[PDB]
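Illustration 12: FK506-binding protein 1A.
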Amino acid sequence: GVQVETISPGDGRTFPKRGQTCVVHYTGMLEDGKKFDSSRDRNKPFKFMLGKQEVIRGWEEGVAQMSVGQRAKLTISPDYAYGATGHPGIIPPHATLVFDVELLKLE
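Figure caption equivalent — predicted structure in token form:
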């Protein structure tokens, strides 16, 4: 459902726990490489609470595998993203997504 590939290693020791706030920089892309969303374009980190299910399933399972300071590519199946319906206009039906995520800190 999510496959993690490291771009830059983190500390290899500090991984998120349920209920912590993950502070990330990210870029999300369709399978064709076209970015649809990026905190890097806004120039402001994005925050989510791990376990709240306020981000897609491939984020909570993928970021949970990351340590502080790690940058990684998360390849997310539609099953772990927006499924059969997608988000029409932005995310097509049955879309595989790629996110470039850096885990900045935990709060």
